[PDB]
Every structure is written in structure tokens, then in C-alpha cells.
């Protein structure tokens, strides 16, 4: 079908233009002032509002397993939520059983997504163990399946955690495949010791989750991951930046040389972790994810500052909330609570409120950190995250003045609590368009189950590897 | 006129693609892999070489031995297809008269497109009205103020606050020459009384501390008023760090290292050869710390410094010999208009610090976004001006005073072996450099007018005005 | 007289030991466990409590008709654990320093309860100021002078005047003190804030942002590093200005910072109070930071050593004296309280939290100050031959600061309601018990002026070497 | 026996005072101007020269040249006490390696000494031996390792276990901070580039791997709330890590050694293999020649606190074992004799710090940290008679021909130092008097140290109450 957006302000990461936009066959066909349109073309009046590239959520965990349970938002309900929020593409993390085949787990995830997802999607593969025969499955995943990003774990002792030797092995190998190396960075050995100590103190409430994983343990694992990456000369991507001190580590490392990228998630940019000390156990357990929200209320603004000057580059969600019934498995033991929070619907609205409405960054920067930087990093740039002739027709009409108060009483998630409850945000989407067709307009949702396509990603993204290739020949 | 570039790797600041570039009528007309062009169309084979937008030198002092023709000629040889030259009036005289004088001399001599900075050497009565004329009528959106040169060009803190507020009202880019003029004065007296008269005394009267100080004062003023500030000629680690730290906090500060400070250091002031030492004399001075050119490049790579310039101001040995007995009398300027893109490439891309995309960003694209010239300049895209360089990353160039396109006897990058230089240069749809042959037209360059309120700078300012109040 | 403290834990900046202290004729005579002494001596049982040197407040403005005179202040200082203060002499711009110093000296010698020394504030760099500075140093015994970068066309010196003053004071071997705020920029913000329609005390904080302090501080350091002299930054009030100092200390320049009890204990959210009289009580220069995270941050820097001394900047004014600027914030008199609360606030923020130990507490309340200003080991040390200015400190004695209980006539206390975990029990000054079990036994005019010698070693030993080191020269060519 | 120093300017960490010092029975008995003394006393005129406390070298590896020639060299150098590292096999007992170290030193040492015990493996049964060492044997300092994979290296969990136990014992926890797991991989990477020379040592242990391990060591200690001590700070990048932590809270102490303060690692690239091998120590000397300057500044402002030497003497023949593989070259440099002289030259003569700070970083701070103050590191009545008369003008140029070591190469070769010891008194005996050496083998005493040094543990005690 065919569609035309008249009289808008097109925002890209590089510039802004007043021009009309014409979409046909799931692509942007023309951009200009006086356009030539063929057959049955529907017209949408933009009225001077911003025309931006639909968001790319780099970090989603829609079918994440934790404590024997699956996240409450599946691929259908998850991506339904994303679209309402202005997110037109996600990259979901595939989470294999430690020891199980990556291929088998990839097909399971692909099957579930292709039948339920409302929007285009890519997949990360989380390498949960460095087992014998893992290297051949990785090669197939890069060259045949179309996956260019793999996540390794420094936390979760004796479950997901890799040693310093194993990390070195895996960074080198993935570097050879030209993959983006994602890292969940928290010291798992110290966490294990601290959880043990806190429980034995009598502290069973969700606060103990935040006390057993203070920001220092994140700062350390982040620095350790950057050190390894700089030895090997490969790009390293830090997922779920939750702390001012981990962000400072990333910042300092970018001055020194190492190719490091940082990804705060909506949670860390929106709220803080003081809610762990809530008298309401249910509410407090809804905030539980790893790494935890910082109990320092000054973190959200500090992270947004770093996102503004370029030290943090992409935003995500880390969306994997559980239902109150699900979480209450850990009523007498915080380590038994399912880790995950919401963010997928709120991500662009939240980034906007903290970064643009406050004046820290402009609308051009907002586009980079919600979609464009993500596409450059993961090798999707011309296709996704740009309003250009030839690119996919994933567009959002954004109203910088439209008010929205985030509540669990109106959110498109299955869970009872929302970590941004009562946050009054100054800037919301009006119209969201996915794959050429309108999915959200005037508060009405028209999404199709299974309509999203899997987007394959080529190895060796130039944004990351162009500097790697040069540093290889300088080294020797 | 009609031109086609086959088999080149097109390099913008955002992505790189293998495609042909098709030029006609002063603009890029088409980009694609299999371009169907008329028979007989003049074709250039790039053969895997890089196709980058021609550089934009943001800091040039050509007008104040080498004329404006020779300057843009050397620019073009080095890959710079646009300059922004600084208008320098005597303090008290009309800005309009000095602008018109510059504009005339350039329009008849410039080989490449150009814009103009106007330096506000004095905040005299009646300067506000002239500034409105320069912005709305004359197409100038950038102005430099000085904090150095006591009793000559220097503006007090009260004056600077007034100037920044008024210039914020116009939507102008405020450039700053940041050194403490009052303290430099005291340091000049002390060094002269010590018997030091040679050019080494110019570096000791202007230590990096005094630079870092004025830079910080400049940012402080800008942060209070809520206006962007642009720091010209970043020469020192300490000043650079001030800028890198202020970016993180809030204020809208931009740094411009010049080729000189990226390529060489200031140990050459201590040479036994007076004529060699004197050639390095500029303000602010090259840091005597040899670790400076790497550090600066590192900040360019991460994003703390944004644009590169040259600070080009050619003086002959005879013209420099004026200060043979007093370093404060030595004319201030170095070379670099030609070497700029070659030096930046060698220090930042050849070493591995950054890639070819960020190279384009620091040599053209960022300057365009800042001074309101994008996407007209600094991008290879349909509709943009045909200012295109066929860059060869492996082509050897040795910088010398024998082969360079200037009448000055000494080069500050003398002996520097670079790996990556221009092969073919295209300005306004026409080939001006090819196979070592220069083919430039005297007076061919057009003046480019720049609107006020560059979106890159002022969109944040606009939002901040609503928030802070 | 003659006094013996037994069973106490003597705490100096360098170590802590269990011993008894024996005082005689205002000096410490013996320290040991089995002291052989006369058997008719007055004796105080400490019971394992801390015996620390009496504090030194390096920043007071008591002589500015006031609600509290020099006597009420020094009485309050003693009760709070402070046994010596260094007051600023504030002359008229253009007038004589010698004349104003004698006026301050006269009033102080007849009112002071405790020992005292005097800072001389150079309000103007007038023709013939150099001759009087030599006199104050060589004849009167003043080694510290404050210059102002703030207050345009009143106290402010230009960059050129500062360089001139710094070089001349270096030659004298004086401690250069600096009130660092950009005067010119404050003026511009003052005009703008008032035109906005803001007349309240909140406008004081808005016209003097923390970035304007930071700037002047960096400038002051930049000048001091070039001349090679020690610079002392009074009233460090902001995170940004404390960082400038921390950084400069690593680069070379001999810079010292002085946070006051105010900036370590409370913030400036109270400027935005509905109650005008309360908000006006907080008004001082530089202002308290609206950033509530500031007092902790500064205490951290005190504890790692980037800040060295604590003062109070005490300048007492009644609610009726403040009300001069009820319709204009710039006319409000600048001054807060803290001469009585200083050591209690510093302890509660620094030692009760675990940031520093009792030993560093001694360093930051007396010893460092003494070293800097050339009063060591006369003051700031419990050692044989040192002055008998002793305090018996109980690390667990609760004290709630209120306007009802404070030793002052002022209606408002900036530390109002703050609960503290460490107080003074016994305070001894010149060998006489001046505070015991709540009882205040002071003597008006008892306090001696202390002359301070030029060229204190703690600052100028490094200067004397760097002068000889000053390498790199013009080439012969 | 009995001794009197007149006309001298006593320099302590806190003040300087012109006064005379009287020594008797190995202690300092009187300090004053006109002292009443017995008749049979030797009088030394100081002539306005500096009278400072003898140095404390906190980092020596003499038994890993013997104990006698080292403490001789130390004495000559100004250092009147060293703290030597007891290094066991990961197949030997701490109790036995201790007594083997103790018996060797007590019969050879010229100056007073204390012992560190290096915990090379966290084995089952170690906790009992440690309780013996603290309570019965007089050791309050222990060093754990994060480098040397599968030999000395402890896992993070073992560090956690170890830091906790040691904190309960009231000890000083020393860390050798380099990442062993990454070093091993970088060794291979450099060997397969065909670099076998000593320069391969510097390249296989870049500073990033030290800074990482330091930061991880600090991070652990902050969770446990114990004081942590970083030995052999060799890099700006590690030194910054330490600097930044100090202002954030954690109780961290850093010990640059004379080598990293006085020279750099450009000498690994020397054409003469024997010389470059002589510079091989771990962590390596930084190839960055800005390092020694940077490190001395950090010593000046207070971010580094004590100076050691890491003195580990190997002859050229013993170094030759790794002529074809840098990984087999024994790690050790010299510095026990030079430590004070070098520190004076780089810190005091440059004007970064004054003589008072000089005493701090050469003795006093050490004494505070390891619980030897005010017995050591202070000229005061009752304190030990370990005095040095220091001449700030006396030239000492450093050469392998002149030094008191059987090694062929000196890492401070040809450094011209202004400022050196004139007289050196140890235990109230003159052992060095302007070139004239008179030491006695075995005269040095073992000095036991108590647990819970207040300099470190006063703040821990408080932080134990506040956190929970």
C-alpha cells in the first residue's frame, strides 16, 4: 500500500528538512516539496510536527528465561508495545541453555518471532557457555543465518559467567568473524560472595539485590572488558550501563583509544533505584533487573549528559518484565526473583523527556541515540534509522509538545507495575508507521501478528571495524 | 559541465559505499553503481581510491608575500575546496568598510569557494548596528572576539558578556581567541628584562596555562548566557582538557585544533637558526611539550575537538626579520593551508586513531554543520556542491619548502613523510588538480553567504531558553 | 595556673597514645603515665575520652553596632571546641591598613576570650600600600593577607593588580588569601536577576552561580603558578571549585583550599524558603550550593587531602540588620554562623561517617592550619613546650544544634535541627578551664594576640627550591 | 655506644628544628640545645646539615648478593631498615618459609629488618598458619598475587576470602596487581611476533593490565571494607586509578619504587642484551618516558605515600637463562642503595616536595602503615637511634663500578644526583661516615609488628558500624 506525509519537519541525525515524504511497497520512495504520486495514495497531514526514523531497540529480552519462567511480554505483545511507543524495530537476545546448541536455540527464537512479531526484528545470540564445538556454530550463525552480534557474560557465576581466559578466547574469535561483541559487565565472583553475605544478614527483600551488586562491581567488569578488548584490538559494546561510575570508565577509555560503545537503557535514564527500599514488596520487586538501578538519584541526569556529549551512543530497553505472581517466587529470597523490568513502550518517550525536553540535546541527537547510532553499529544504517530514499518505510510522526503521564493503568504491557509510574513526559508520538503501513494513529492500534520480517545483518560493520583493520597493520 | 567518477569508494562522515559519482552544472547529479551516462562523457577512473568531500578550512588569515590567489591555489592542491577567511579591521574603524575591502579582494583572486569571519577587534559605540547589517544583509554568521593583546584587541569580562549576549540574539557563531592578554603582558615584560629576545621568548611569554585560563573563562561566560562558544586555535593539552570537561557538563563548546598543533610541536623555537624559529611564531604558540600533537589528535578521534583548521598566515623571512631584536614584533602566522588534509590524515587515520569517515567529519562535514553550510558542502550526496577529492590513502607525500605552493622560505612540517594525499581535486564541477598539474582560475571562487542560527548549534539553545527561566 | 588531665587518649594528627597531660603556666610541661607532680593539683578524669588540641578557625569576620561583638564570638568559639581564631581586618578602600589593624587589634585585645591572630584584607591596591605591608609583616606580626576578585569597583583587583600583589606578597613571605569569585560577571547577573523581578535571597544564589567561583579560583591558581607562590582559596563552597583545586595540586602549583563549616554541613536549598528571615540568614559570599550533594563531596576531598583546613567564615547579623535588603538581595549583609558549630559539624560529617579518623580530624581542625600560618608546633599539637589549648572530646556525646541553645543573639541558625554525634566536654584555654559540664567560665580580654613570622616552612621551602630550579632559558644563538 | 650530634637541623615529617641529639643504648635520649651528658662521648658536628630519620625500604626481595651485602648497601644508601618479602613455594608452608627467612637474616643482617610473608596459594590449612604469623611471630603484612597464572595467582573468590580473613586478623594487605590470565595470552601474542628480547617483557605486560588488576584489587577491598596496599606502582595509568579511588572512599595506599621514579623502560630496547635484561622486573618499567615525572608528582600531592625499591639482585649469568625467551629471565632490579638518593633527586631537587615530605615518603608514612611509628621514622625522645646526616649538596653519581653489589649492571647507571648521606647511624652506631663503612654481620634485629595499625584500622572500625 501507498502513503504520503505532507508538510512535516523530517528529522535525521545530520540535519532537518521541511519536505513531503512518499512511501510505496515498504520503502521511502520520494522526498521533496512538490511530489509526484501514482495510484491509491492515502494522505496524512503532519502540520509542522517532526518526521523521525522509527526507533531501534538494541536490547530486548522478550522470551528471556529466569528461574524457570518466561517473560510476561511475548513476541506479539512485546512488539505491539514497541510500536505504540515509537519503536519500529527491535533486536532480541536469544538465550540458550548453557551447554545447548546455539543453532537449535536460534531456530526456536526465529520461529516464535516470525509467527508473533508485529515489527521487523534482528537477533543477538547470547553465548552462555564456551563449550566444545561452539566455534563452528558461531561461524554458521554469522555467515549463513545473518547474526552479527553476540553477548558474553561476566556475571552469573558458574551459570553464564566466562573466565578472563574464556573471554579472551571469545573476543579474538568473534573479532575474526567481524561480529559486534556485546558484554553484560558485572563481577560475578564478588556478586556471588555478596549475595551469600547479605542473605545471611537477614536481608531477604529486593533491596538486598541492589546491595549485593553495588555500582563498583559494574565499574570493575566494564573496565576489565575494555582492557581485554584493547589488548586484542576489537570493538566492545557495553550493555545495560546502569551506573555513573561505569559510564565514567567508558568515557575515559574513549579518550585513550579502545573502541568502546555504551548502552544505557530506558530504566537507568528514566528512574533510579530508591524504590527497592519501598514498603511495597511487589513494587520493589518490579524494579529488580541486572545490573540494578542505582540508588543514587543523580544517575539518570548524569547518564543523559554523557549520552548528549557522545560518550554513550545508543539507547535500549532491556525489556523483560515479569508478572507480580511470577516475581513472588522470591518472596523470602531476593536471588529467586526473576530479573527484568519494562521499558519497550516508554523508551523513546523517556529518552525524549530527559534529554530533549530538558535541553541537553536537540531533536537531531535524539534520532541518533534512539535509532541511527544503533543501525551504524549493527550494520543496518542506510536501511533503518534514516529518512532517505531507498530506506525502509519505518517512520514516526513525533509531537514535541504532546503530554503523556506514564501509568501501569494505560500501558500496553501485561505486568501490574511500571517503573516510570507517574512520570509526566513532554513529547510523544502521534502516528507510527511500520513496513509502509500505519500501526498507530490517534490512540488506535492496528498491528498484525507475524507481519514483521527478520532482518539479516552482514559481518564487519564499517563503523566499528574500519579502525580495527588499520590498527592491525600498525601493531606489527 | 558534465563529469563521471567510476569505481570509487565514496566516503562521507556517516557511511561509505562503492558507487559512481556523476557531476553536472556545479552539483552532484546522481550516485549509483551502474550509471547510464551519455556517450563521450568525460570519465575519471578512481579505481578503488577514496572519493571524499573537499575540505573546509575554518581558520585562515590570507589577507593580513602570498596573496589570496596563491592561498586558495595551495588550498586546492592540498584538497581544501573551501576556506573561511578572517576579516581584521583596525580597532575603531567600521566593520562594514573592512568587510567590503576583504570581500572585493577575494572575489577577484579566490580560486575556490569562500566565506568570511569578521573579527570584532573593538567594542566601539555603533558596532551593534553594523553587526546586524553583517548578519542579515551581508551573509556573515561568525565573528571572533579576542581576550589576548592588551589595550589593542582585548575585551574585558564586561565587554565579552555584552558581546556574547548580543551575538546570541543574532544567531551568530561566536569564535574566541583565548589567551589571557593581561598576564601575557606581565610575562612579556619579565622575559624581555631577562635578556631573552629570540622567538623562544614568544613561547615563554605565552605558556599553555594562560591559554587554558582564558578558554575556561570563555566557556564560563557562554554557559551563563546560554550561547555556543567556539575556541579557535587549540594548541595545548591543558586547554583541550578544559574543553573536553565542559562538554560533559553542559555548555555548548567547540574546539578547533589547527594543522600546526596536530602535526608538529614547539621545540623548534629553541633552534640555533633564528629564521627557522621565527617561522613557527604564531598565537597561541605551539606547545613545547612533544606529547601535545598526539594528545590533541586523540581528542579529535573521540569527539572533544570537532573541526580542523590551518591558521594559515604567510610571512616571508624578510617580513619576519622585523622582530630580529624583539620577539613581540615578529609577525604572527604559520603555514598549513596546503598541508592540512595530509597532516590530519597522517596523524589520525594512518596511526589508527580514527577511520576515513571521521576524517571527513573533522576535515569538512563538522565545519559545515557548525557554520550553516550543510548539506551544501561537506557531503557527497545528490544536490550538494561538486566539491570532490579523489583521495589516495597509499600515495606518498613528503612535505618540503622546495615543492610547496608558497613563497615562504620555511615550512613547519618540513621533512614530514605522510601516507595519503589527494590525486584529483574537483571544485565547482571542474578539475583543478590532476596528475600534479594545477589548473585554477583567478577569481573563479564565489562568496558563500551563511544564514544565522545554525540548527546544529542553536536548536539546543532555543530549548534551553525555555527551560532556564 | 596548674592542671592535670589523666586517663585520656591524646589524639594528635600523627598518632594516638594513652597518656596523661600536665599543664603549667599556659604551657604543656609533661606527658606520660606515672607523672611525678605536686599532690595538691587540680585534676580532671578523662575516662578514656579524647584529648585533642583546641581548634583553630582560620576564617572569622567578628568585627563587622552588631548583634554579637568580639567577646560573644570568642565565647562561642570556646564552647564549640575552637581555642583560637584568625579574624579578618576589613579596611575602607583607599584608607590605611596600619590604622585599621590597630583599630581591630585594640577592640580585640579588650574583648577576646581566646588567643587570636589577624588577617589583613587588602581592599584596594592604592599608591603606597607596599610600605604598610612591609610594616604589618616585619613589625606587627601579620603573615596573611586576603585579596578580592569579587565586588566590582569596591574590593576587586584586576588580573594585572593580582599579579602585582602576588609577586610582592611572595617577596614578603606572606600567605596569599583569595576571595575568588568573578566580580564583573556577578555584576552582569545581578543586573539581570533584578530586572527579572527577583528581589528575594534566592536571587543572591542565582547571581553568584558556582561556575563563577570555579572560574576565579582557576584564575587565581593560574597566576600563582606563574609567579611560583602559595595561594590560599578561602570559602570553598562548590563541587566545581573544589575539583579545580584537587586537579591543580597534582600539576604543581601550591594551592590550599578552605571549605567552611557552612559548606560542609548544610546546602543552599534554604534560600528558596517561604520564610524570608530564614533565607536571609543563609546569605554569605560565596553562597551555599543549591546542589544538596555538595557537603558530602567537599568532606570527601577534605578526607583525601585535596582540601586542608576548615574555617567557619563567621559573620553575625540580626534579623533586623539583614532586613536592610528586604526588597533587594544585594543589600543583604553577607554573613552566616558557624564559629560555635565548626568542630561539631566537621566531626559529624567527616568522622561519624567514617570518611576520616580522629587523627585527620585533628589535622583539618587545628594542625594543618597551624602549619600553613606558622603557628606549629605552638598550636595544633599536644606536645611538651606547646600552648595549653586542650579539648576533651567525647566521640559519642549527642548535641542538637538549635537557635534556642546556641551562644548567640542571632535569631536563626543555619545548622538548625542537625543532630550530631560528638561534642566537647572540657575546654581549656591558656591552661584555664573555660568550659566544663555545660558551665562557661570565660574572661573578657584575657586572650593574647599571636604574632606570626613570615616565610612559613610548610609553604615556602618548596618555593625557595623552585626559584633555584626555574630552568629552561633563552638560546645564545 | 654513646654519641652526640651537634649543630644539626633535625628534619621530621611535621616540622624542622635546630637542636642537638644525644644517643645511648640504641635509642634517642635527649633533644635540646645545651645537653647535660656523660664525659666519655663521641661528638659529631653536623655543621648546619640535615639530621633525618633513617629510611624504611618497604619492598625488598633479598633472599629470592645475600642478606648481608644488601643491608650493607641499604645502610650506605641511607636506609636503616628494610622489610623483606618471605617467598615460599606453592608446595611449602608459610611457617617454615618464615623461619628459613628469619634464621638467614638474623645471622646476616646489618640493619634492623621486618618480614612480609607472601601468600603464594590459598590452600586448605593456610588460615592457621596466618594466625601464628600475626599473633606469635610478629608479622602484620602479607602479599597476595593476581599475576603468574597457575603458580601464584588467586581467583577473585580467593581474594575475597583472603582479604576478609586478613582484615579479621588486622593485617596490612599487599597486592601484586597485574592480570595473570591476560599476561599469559599476551606473552604468546608477542612470542609469535618473533620478539624474544627483554623488550618482549614490557610489551607482554602493558600498563593497561596493571591498572586493571589494581582497580579490581581496590574494588574487592571496598566491598569488604579493608585497607589495601598496591606494591610496585610502575605506571601513570595505575597511579591514576589509585588517585581516583582515594577521593571516592576506599582505603588505598600505593608504593612506587625507586626504579619507576628514577628511570623508564626505554632501556628494554637497548642493543646490549645484558643491560636491557638487567631492567626486567614485574610490573615492568613503563616505556613512556613521562612516567617517572608523573609518578613523583603523585608522590608529592599525597596520592602515593611510601617508597620502596623492589630490590631483587640477579647476576648477568642468572639473567642469561632467558637469552632466547624473555619469559625465563628472572624478574628483579636493583634499588636498595639508590632509593633515597634517587627520590631526593627526582622529588626534592626538582622542587616538587620539601625535605619534610621527603622524610614522610622515605620513612614516616611507612612507619605509620606498618605500625613502626614512632619507634622508626621519627627523631624524637624514646625513638630508635636510626639517624642519618643528610647533605643536600653532596654529589653521588651512580655506577656499576662503584655500587655494593655483585651485579654487572645498574639500572640508574650514570645518573648524577645532588644530595646524599654523609653519616649513617644504625642502632646508635656509626656504620657509614663519608665513604668509610663499618658494619657488623648479624647485628640487625628482627622487629615484630602488632596487628591493627591505627593509621589504617581506625577508619575501618568506624565504617564497620555505619554501613549496616
Q: What is the 3-state secondary structure (H, E, C) of chain D?
A: CEEEEECCEEECCCCEEECEEEEECCEEEEEECCCCCCCCCEEEECCCCEEEECEEEEEECCCCCCHHHHHHHHHHHCEEEEEEEECCCCCCCHHHHHHHHHHHHHCCCCCEEEEEEECCCCCCCHHHHHHHHHHCCCCCEEEEECCCCCCCECCHHHHHHHHHHHHHHCCEEEEECCCHHHHHHHHHHHHCCCCCCCHHHHHHCCHHHHHHHHHHHHHHHHHHCCCEEEEEECCHHHHHHHHHHHHHCCCEEEEEEHHHHHCCHHHHHCCCHHHHHHCCCCCCCCCCCCHHHHHHHHHHHCCCCCCECCECCCCHHHHHHHCCCHHHCCCCECCCCCHHHHHHHHHHCCCCCCHHHHHHHHHHHHHHHCCCCCCCCCCCCCCECCEEEEEEEEEEECCCCCCCCCCCCCCCCCCEEEEEEEEEEECCEEEEECCEECCCCCCCCECCCCCCCHHHHHHHHHHHHHCC
Q: Between chains, do A257 and B298 touch, taking CB under 8 Å as contact?
A: yes
User: In terms of domains, do A39 and A147 share one?
Assistant: no
Nearest by CB to B272, which of C219, C474, C475? C475
Nearest to D140 by CA among D168, D115, D177, D112: D115
User: In terms of domains, do D374 and D423 share one?
Assistant: no
The verdict on whether omega for the bond into residue A291 sits within 30 degrees of 0, i.e. cis, is yes
For residue A248, list chain D residues with Cβ-Cβ distance below 8 A.
none
Contact (CB, 8 A) for A244 and A298: yes
CB-facing half-sphere around the CA of C285: CA atoms within 13 A = 23
At residue C157, the 3 state secondary structure works out as coil
DSSP state of A319: B
For residue A471, list chain B residues with Cβ-Cβ distance below 8 A.
352
Instruction: Check CB contact of C161 with chain B, cutoff 8 Å.
Output: no
At residue B399, the 3 state secondary structure works out as coil
Residue of D458, D460, D467, D468 to mutate for C, most C C-beta atoms under 10 A: D458
User: In terms of domains, do C368 and C454 share one?
Assistant: no
Cα–Cα distance measured from residue C115 to residue C108, given in angstroms and rounded to the nearest whole number: 10
Instruction: Check CB contact of D291 with chain A, cutoff 8 Å.
Output: no
- Please count the residue pairs, one from chain C and one from chain D, whose beta carbons lie less than 8 angstroms apart: 81
Domain containing A113 equals 54-426
Experimentally, how was this structure solved? X-ray
What are the backbone dihedrals phi and psi of residue A31, each rounded to the nearest 5 degrees, phi first?
-135, 125
Q: Between chains, do D219 and A217 touch, taking CB under 8 Å as contact?
A: yes
CB-facing half-sphere around the CA of A311: CA atoms within 13 A = 27
Last residue of a domain, one of D386, D403, D418: D418
Q: Which cell numbers hold the place of B274?
A: 633564528
Instruction: Give me the residues paired with residue A340 across strands.
Output: none
For residue C477, list chain B residues with Cβ-Cβ distance below 8 A.
198, 272, 274
Nearest by CB to B217, which of C160, C187, C215? C215
Q: Which cell numbers hold the place of D184?
A: 599469559
Rg of the Cα trace of chain A?
21
User: In terms of domains, do A200 and A342 share one?
Assistant: yes
Q: Between chains, do D454 and C306 touch, taking CB under 8 Å as contact?
A: no
For residue A476, list chain D residues with Cβ-Cβ distance below 8 A.
193
Q: Between chains, do A231 and D160 touch, taking CB under 8 Å as contact?
A: no
Q: Which residue does chain A place closest to B16, by CA atoms?
A: A462
Contact (CB, 8 A) for C393 and C426: no
User: In terms of domains, do A26 and A169 share one?
Assistant: no
Nearest by CB to A231, which of D186, D220, D468? D186
Residue of D212, D250, D288 to mutate for A, most A C-beta atoms under 10 A: D212
CB-facing half-sphere around the CA of B92: CA atoms within 13 A = 2
Q: Smallest CA–CA separation between D430 and chain C, in Å? A: 29
Q: Between chains, do A189 and D223 touch, taking CB under 8 Å as contact?
A: no
User: In terms of domains, do B428 and B446 share one?
Assistant: yes
Cα–Cα distance measured from residue D300 to residue D154, given in angstroms and rounded to the nearest whole number: 33
Where are the alpha helices (H) located in A65-187, listed in sequence order?
A: 75-85, 102-116, 134-140, 164-176
User: In terms of domains, do A42 and A138 share one?
Assistant: no
User: In terms of domains, do D82 and D94 share one?
Assistant: yes
Cα–Cα distance measured from residue A86 to residue A440, given in angstroms and rounded to the nearest whole number: 9
Q: Between chains, do B187 and C226 touch, taking CB under 8 Å as contact?
A: yes
Nearest by CB to C219, which of B161, B200, B213? B213
Cα–Cα distance measured from residue C40 to residue A445, given in angstroms and rounded to the nearest whole number: 96
Q: Which cell numbers hold the place of C162?
A: 593580582
User: In terms of domains, do B136 and B156 share one?
Assistant: yes
For residue C473, list chain B residues with Cβ-Cβ distance below 8 A.
194, 196
Q: Between chains, do C357 and D462 touch, taking CB under 8 Å as contact?
A: yes
Domain count, chain A: 2
Q: Which cell numbers hold the place of B203?
A: 613561547
Instruction: Check CB contact of A353 with chain B, cutoff 8 Å.
Output: no
Q: Which cell numbers hold the place of A17?
A: 528538512
Cα–Cα distance measured from residue B292 to residue B295, given in angstroms and rounded to the nearest whole number: 5
Q: Smallest CA–CA separation between A269 and chain D, in Å? A: 23
Contact (CB, 8 A) for C294 and C287: no
Handedness of CA D341, D343, D344, D346 (dihedral sign): positive
Cα–Cα distance measured from residue C258 to residue C260, given in angstroms and rounded to the nearest whole number: 6
CB-facing half-sphere around the CA of B244: CA atoms within 13 A = 25
Query: CB neighbours (10 Å) of residue D161?
Result: 17
Q: Which residue does chain C place closest to D239, by CA atoms?
A: C250
| CATH number where C35 lies | 2.30.40.10
Q: Smallest CA–CA separation between B183 and chain C, in Å? A: 7
Cα–Cα distance measured from residue D437 to residue D453, given in angstroms and rounded to the nearest whole number: 35
User: In terms of domains, do B405 and B451 share one?
Assistant: no
Handedness of CA B142, B143, B144, B145 (dihedral sign): negative
Q: Smallest CA–CA separation between C211 and chain B, in Å? A: 6
Whole-Å CA distances, B427 to B77, B443, B446, D456: 11, 13, 11, 70
Nearest by CB to C474, which of B187, B196, B213? B196
Q: Between chains, do D181 and A189 touch, taking CB under 8 Å as contact?
A: no
Contact (CB, 8 A) for C308 and C256: yes
For residue D184, list chain A residues with Cβ-Cβ distance below 8 A.
165
Q: Between chains, do C359 and D458 touch, taking CB under 8 Å as contact?
A: yes
User: In terms of domains, do B336 and B463 share one?
Assistant: no
Query: CB neighbours (10 Å) of residue D464?
Result: 13
Cα–Cα distance measured from residue A393 to residue A387, given in angstroms and rounded to the nearest whole number: 8
Q: Between chains, do D160 and A217 touch, taking CB under 8 Å as contact?
A: no
Q: Which cell numbers hold the place of C309?
A: 583546613
| CATH number where A345 lies | 3.20.20.140
Report resolution (Å) to 1 decimal: 3.0
Nearest by CB to A474, which of B16, B351, B468? B351
Q: Which cell numbers hold the place of D238?
A: 595505575
Handedness of CA C360, C361, C365, C366 (dihedral sign): negative
Q: Between chains, do B209 and C189 touch, taking CB under 8 Å as contact?
A: no
**Residue numbers of B between 12 and 51 with CB closer than 8 Å to A:** 13-17
At residue C180, the 3 state secondary structure works out as coil
Q: Between chains, do D223 and A192 touch, taking CB under 8 Å as contact?
A: no
Cα–Cα distance measured from residue C397 to residue C394, given in angstroms and rounded to the nearest whole number: 6
Whole-Å CA distances, C156 to C146, C148, C152, C153, C183: 11, 5, 5, 6, 7
Nearest to C4 by CA among C13, C31, C18: C31
User: In terms of domains, do B321 and B341 share one?
Assistant: yes
Indicate the pairing of strand D16-18 with strand D9-11. Answer: antiparallel
Amino acid at each position: 500500500d501507498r502513503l504520503l506525509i505532507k508538510g512535516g519537519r523530517i528529522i535525521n541525525d545530520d540535519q532537518s528538512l521541511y519536505a513531503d515524504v512518499y512511501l510505496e511497497d515498504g520503502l521511502i520512495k520520494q522526498i521533496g516539496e512538490n511530489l509526484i504520486v501514482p495510484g491509491g495514495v492515502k494522505t496524512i497531514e503532519a502540520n509542522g510536527r517532526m518526521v523521525i526514523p522509527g526507533g531501534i531497540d538494541v536490547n530486548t529480552y522478550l522470551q528471556k528465561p529466569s528461574q524457570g519462567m518466561t517473560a510476561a511480554d511475548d513476541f506479539f505483545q512485546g512488539t505491539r508495545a514497541a510500536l505504540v511507543g515509537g519503536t519500529t524495530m527491535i533486536i532480541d537476545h536469544v538465550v540458550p541453555e548453557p551447554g545447548s546448541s546455539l543453532l537449535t536455540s536460534f531456530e526456536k527464537w526465529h520461529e516464535a518471532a516470525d509467527t508473533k512479531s508485529c515489527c521487523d526484528y534482528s537477533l543477538h545470540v547470547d553465548i552462555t557457555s564456551w563449550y566444545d564445538g561452539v566455534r563452528e556454530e558461531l561461524e554458521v550463525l554469522v555467515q549463513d543465518k545473518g547474526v552479527n552480534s553476540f553477548q558474553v557474560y561476566m556475571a552469573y557465576k558458574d551459570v553464564y559467567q566466562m573466565s578472563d581466559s574464556q573471554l579472551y578466547e571469545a573476543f579474538t574469535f568473534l573479532k575474526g568473524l567481524g561480529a559486534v561483541i556485546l558484554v553484560h559487565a558485572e563481577n560475578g565472583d564478588l556478586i556471588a560472595q555478596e549475595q551469600k553475605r547479605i542473605l545471611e544478614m537477614g536481608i531477604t527483600g529486593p533491596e538486598g539485590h541492589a546491595l549485593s551488586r553495588p555500582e563498583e562491581l559494574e565499574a570493575e567488569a566494564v573496565f576489565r572488558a575494555i582492557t581485554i578488548a584493547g589488548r586484542i584490538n576489537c570493538p566492545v559494546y557495553i550493555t545495560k550501563v546502569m551506573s555513573k561510575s561505569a559510564a565514567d570508565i567508558i568515557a575515559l577509555a574513549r579518550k585513550k583509544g579502545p573502541l568502546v560503545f555504551g548502552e544505557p537503557i530506558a530504566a537507568s535514564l528514566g528512574t533510579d533505584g530508591t524504590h527497592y527500599w519501598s514498603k511495597n514488596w511487589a513494587k520493589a520487586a518490579a524494579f529488580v533487573t541486572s545490573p540494578p538501578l542505582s540508588p543514587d538519584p543523580t544517575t539518570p541526569d548524569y547518564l543523559t549528559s554523557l549520552l548528549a556529549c557522545g560518550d554513550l551512543q545508543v539507547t535500549g530497553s532491556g525489556h523483560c518484565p515479569y508478572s507480580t505472581a511470577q516475581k513472588a517466587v522470591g518472596k523470602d529470597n531476593f536471588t529467586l526473583i526473576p530479573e527484568g523490568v519494562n521499558g519497550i513502550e516508554e523508551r523513546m518517550t523517556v529518552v525524549w523527556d530527559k534529554a530533549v525536553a530538558t535541553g541537553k540535546m536537540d531533536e537531531n541527537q535524539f534520532v541518533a541515540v534512539t535509532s541511527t547510532n544503533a543501525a551504524k553499529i549493527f550494520n543496518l544504517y542506510p536501511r533503518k534509522g534514516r529518512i532517505a530514499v531507498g530506506s525502509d518505510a519505518d517512520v514516526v510522526i513525533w509531537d514535541p509538545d504532546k503530554l503523556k503521564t506514564i501509568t501501569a493503568k494505560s500501558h500496553k504491557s501485561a505486568v501490574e507495575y511500571n517503573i516510570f509510574e507517574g512520570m509526566e513526559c513532554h513529547g510523544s508520538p502521534l502516528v507510527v508507521i511500520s513496513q509502509g503501513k500505519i500501526v498507530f494513529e490517534d490512540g488506535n492500534i492496528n498491528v498484525n501478528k507475524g507481519m514483521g520480517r527478520f532482518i539479516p545483518r552482514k559481518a564487519f560493520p564499517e563503523h566499528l571495524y574500519q579502525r580495527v583493520k588499520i590498527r592491525n597493520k600498525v601493531f606489527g
